[PDB]
Symmetry: C2
Subunit: 195 residues, 2 copies
């Protein structure tokens, strides 16, 4: 089965993280949540106060063979990711071993740009944090998939469905992405993978 490592830190955006996890599970992807920047503590207080329990500390799962690493946004959670040497090295290792990096909202600008992980990749993120993404790299689009570098980015809490569906499409295929989309009662405007 395909698998995903979803990272969580104090201040992660809970709608982004939880919507993504839920959709991936609906897609038949095995999801492990990892606590970042918590010295092993699994209880994570998210950006609006939602409290989640992660499965494991990052240091215990970072070398697993997951197909994708997912970085939720949330201002402070993304800062924790940026300032975690283990998180940054893990992202780099996923990329160099041919796997997918997926990041939403503040995570592209806060994590990927300062560490120069994808120096010429195309990416999006939260629109009013546009200035923090190099102008030549920026696209203002609900989801961006840069197939060349296997970088998936997305914009905000309201694009979390679009983000999760594209992960499903990439790891388990279009038909499964459509099946999941069909379970949700999605808003007009969001791509449902029927075509």
């Amino acid at each position: 089965s395909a698998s995903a490592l979803v990272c969580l830190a104090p201040g992660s955006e809970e709608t982004e993280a939880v919507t993504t996890i839920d959709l991936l599970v609906r897609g038949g992807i095995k999801v492990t949540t990892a606590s970042v920047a918590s010295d092993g503590n699994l209880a994570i207080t998210c950006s609006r106060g939602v409290k989640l329990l992660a499965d494991a500390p990052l240091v215990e799962v970072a070398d697993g063979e997951y197909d994708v690493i997912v970085l939720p946004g949330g201002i402070k959670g993304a800062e924790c990711f940026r300032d975690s040497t283990l998180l940054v090295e893990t992202v780099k290792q996923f990329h160099r071993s041919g796997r997918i990096v997926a990041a939403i909202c503040a995570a592209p600008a806060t994590v990927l740009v300062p560490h120069d992980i994808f120096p010429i990749g195309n990416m999006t993120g939260f629109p009013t944090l546009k200035d923090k993404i190099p102008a030549e790299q920026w696209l203002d689009k609900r989801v961006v998939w840069d197939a060349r570098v296997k970088l998936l980015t997305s914009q905000g809490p309201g694009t979390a469905i679009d983000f999760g569906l594209k992960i499903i499409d990439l790891l388990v295929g279009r038909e499964k992405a459509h099946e999941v989309a069909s379970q949700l009662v999605m808003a007009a405007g969001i791509y449902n993978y029927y075509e």
Copy 2:
């Protein structure tokens, strides 16, 4: 000053619950989460495995001064709600005291219909459970607000933003609902409270 009691059970739909909580907090609404687990456990495993911590057992907060009681869906979470005499009594008390009941996905058909809490009024819910709503009550709308009985219902994980925004409208007003919506990068098919 407005406040919301968001109920949680084993098997609740985590995207519905968490998206709603996040939006209400963004709207300046005080949120308390209440576990309806039969043993009072607060560490809830949701329908796709997300582990969410409730603030309090329902018995400790049911008599509180909340403007709305929120029932997330999730097949098994809604069954837990239906089968909890305290939950059902609390919903009835919110309604009889002139407060709002808000329910999404399976919660209308599983909780509200069998207990006949709203014998008259329009409601929606998850479309595969349409035949579990009395035909004279059913509408196929992303959100249904029946002000005559102060009943707010909605359809599924993908309508959680619409649902949360309508709670904001009902507790705080259109201006705040538009403010919150404007934060989210939400899809064009979701009403944004701007005219």
